[PDB]
Amino acid sequence: AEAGITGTWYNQLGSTFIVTAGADGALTGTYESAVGNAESRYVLTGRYDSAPATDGSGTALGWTVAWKNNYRNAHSATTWSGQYVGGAEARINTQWLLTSGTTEANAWKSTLVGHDTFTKVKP
Amino acid sequence: AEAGITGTWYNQLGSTFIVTAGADGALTGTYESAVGNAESRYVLTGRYDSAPATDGSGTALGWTVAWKNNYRNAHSATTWSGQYVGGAEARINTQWLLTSGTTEANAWKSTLVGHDTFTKVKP
Amino acid sequence: AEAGITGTWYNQLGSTFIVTAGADGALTGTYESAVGNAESRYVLTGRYDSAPATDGSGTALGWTVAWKNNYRNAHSATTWSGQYVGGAEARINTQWLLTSGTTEANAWKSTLVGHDTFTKVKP
Amino acid sequence: AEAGITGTWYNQLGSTFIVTAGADGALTGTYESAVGNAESRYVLTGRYDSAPATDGSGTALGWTVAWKNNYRNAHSATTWSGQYVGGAEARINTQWLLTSGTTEANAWKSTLVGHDTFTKVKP
Ligand SMILES: O=C1N[C@H]2NC(=O)N[C@H]2N1
Ligand SMILES: O=C1N[C@H]2NC(=O)N[C@H]2N1
Ligand SMILES: O=C1N[C@H]2NC(=O)N[C@H]2N1
Ligand SMILES: O=C1N[C@H]2NC(=O)N[C@H]2N1
Numbered sequence: 001a002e003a004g005i006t007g008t009w010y011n012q013l014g015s016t017f018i019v020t021a022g023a024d025g026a027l028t029g030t031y032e033s034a035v036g037n038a039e040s041r042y043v044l045t046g047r048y049d050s051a052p053a054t055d056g057s058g059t060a061l062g063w064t065v066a067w068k069n070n071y072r073n074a075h076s077a078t079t080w081s082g083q084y085v086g087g088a089e090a091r092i093n094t095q096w097l098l099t100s101g102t103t104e105a106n107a108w109k110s111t112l113v114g115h116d117t118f119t120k121v122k123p
Numbered sequence: 124a125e126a127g128i129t130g131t132w133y134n135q136l137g138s139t140f141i142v143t144a145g146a147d148g149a150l151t152g153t154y155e156s157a158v159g160n161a162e163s164r165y166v167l168t169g170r171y172d173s174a175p176a177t178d179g180s181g182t183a184l185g186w187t188v189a190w191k192n193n194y195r196n197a198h199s200a201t202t203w204s205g206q207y208v209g210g211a212e213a214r215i216n217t218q219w220l221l222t223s224g225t226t227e228a229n230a231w232k233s234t235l236v237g238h239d240t241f242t243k244v245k246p
Numbered sequence: 247a248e249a250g251i252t253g254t255w256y257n258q259l260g261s262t263f264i265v266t267a268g269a270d271g272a273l274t275g276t277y278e279s280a281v282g283n284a285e286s287r288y289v290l291t292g293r294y295d296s297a298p299a300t301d302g303s304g305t306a307l308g309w310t311v312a313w314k315n316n317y318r319n320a321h322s323a324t325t326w327s328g329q330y331v332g333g334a335e336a337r338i339n340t341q342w343l344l345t346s347g348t349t350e351a352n353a354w355k356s357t358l359v360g361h362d363t364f365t366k367v368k369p
Numbered sequence: 370a371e372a373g374i375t376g377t378w379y380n381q382l383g384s385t386f387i388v389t390a391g392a393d394g395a396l397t398g399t400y401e402s403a404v405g406n407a408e409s410r411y412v413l414t415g416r417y418d419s420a421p422a423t424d425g426s427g428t429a430l431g432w433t434v435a436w437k438n439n440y441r442n443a444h445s446a447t448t449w450s451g452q453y454v455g456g457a458e459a460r461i462n463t464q465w466l467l468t469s470g471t472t473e474a475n476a477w478k479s480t481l482v483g484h485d486t487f488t489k490v491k492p
Binding site: 271272273289290291292293294295296297298299301302303304305306307308309310311312313314319320321322323324325326327328329331339340341342343344345346347348349350353356357359 | 394452464466469
């Protein structure tokens with residue numbers, strides 16, 4: 001975990017995220033999305049659970065990206081929840097929630113759900 | 124948003140989260156869960172999109188809590204994705220993903236999905 | 247369950263669904279949505295698990311509505327997954343997935359997630 | 370769609386589902402799960418939206434399986450929401466919700482979310 005998590009990861013859509021997993025469960029980094037109302041890099045912050053494992057389980061973690069930077073303001077935020085599996089072919093398997101800011105009338109349709117798999121190799 | 128978000132919020136399960144929304148989209152604080160394999164306060168970190176709105180839309184945001192502190196290590200992490208609606212009765216409406224670290228055989232059943240509504244009043 | 251489920255239910259958005267729970271786990275009926283690219287009644291079909299419970303647990307069930315009828319064709323389908331809780335104030339608590347048919351380029355953003363609570367009283 | 374959907378499909382976990390898509394949006398068939406508190410075949414019912422598409426979009430559909438048959442009663446139900454993409458390598462991409470019947474105290478953790486991809490070839 002931690003050391004194993006720090007680095008550059010790529011997902012199936014071609015997005016890239018660079019993260020640093022700190023000693024006490026913090027995750028900090030940047031995310032560049034290959035799809036969406038996203039342009040350039042966005043700041044990401046999250047946490048991982050730093051004391052994962054005598055039965056080769058994954059390390060649970062999550063992070064958030066607010067889609068606003070100096071080139072775009074998409075009025076939305078995405079959170080990724082999943083686990084890090086290390087090894088030869090280490091990966092982070094996630095499910096994500098993308099919520100857009102809406103008026104109250106459209107709040108029922110404000111959130112998209114999806115899944116992303118990240119690897120150290122692209123892809 | 125931001126100022127409006129900073130403070131103490133409570134949800135329908137009796138959990139409490141105190142957050143500070145910083146000038147540039149950062150969210151930092153603590154979360155105390157009334158249910159689960161959770162005991163005491165846990166650190167939370169997230170982001171909000173700091174330039175939300177000429178049509179009274181909500182402010183999108185998200186945060187993560189890794190369920191590990193000095194009293195418990197639940198080997199899981201939860202991410203909340205939603206939006207802040209301010210006003211008289213301001214609230215943060217969210218959907219969450221709770222992922223547990225599992226062996227590869229059980230990874231298909233590693234994530235729970237739910238929804239929480241937070242208010243400034245409890246509840 | 248079954249008998250308890252058969253009837254008319256209403257949710258927080260003002261939608262109404264009439265269902266008949268058959269002896270062997272089948273659910274058949276119609277759904278009229280108060281929001282969306284929906285007009286009139288749509289056919290629904292689902293299942294419930296007909297042998298639910300010495301510890302007052304809910305009865306798990308699910309149903310699907312394809313948003314096509316003789317007045318509208320929204321090219322989408324919604325599935326509701328949840329449980330029936332009977333009693334004085336019986337309710338069906340659900341989480342739903344609404345998938346729209348998209349081109350392959352937009353498949354990552356094809357599904358919305360939400361939650362609906364149905365009661366026998368409106369609302 | 371419809372004709373294209375009728376047949377046997379397999380997913381990444383080795384589950385198999387045989388379905389018949391009827392002329393007016395109905396889906397009927399059986400599902401055999403390779404994982405879980407599932408043994409043998411279970412009945413499935415759903416709907417698809419029968420008038421999908423001048424821009425090669427997928428056909429939205431959904432189905433439900435209550436995990437009860439003559440060999441097992443898992444007190445749960447799963448709904449799959451997604452779209453059918455036809456062609457050489459046709460597939461049905463889905464996201465699913467598995468709800469278990471719980472007591473009211475545990476209702477917040479009653480639903481798991483996941484994703485399955487089905488192909489006509491196994492896998
Ligand atoms: O990498 C990405 N994953 C998808 N989820 C999301 O929010 N934007 C898309 N880009
Ligand atoms: O406040 C809480 N919300 C629920 N989601 C979660 O992860 N733990 C529970 N407590
Ligand atoms: O009743 C409704 N619930 C929401 N989900 C959905 O698919 N349409 C909306 N209407
Ligand atoms: O095929 C399967 N998919 C998964 N979802 C589910 O409910 N059971 C598992 N089996």
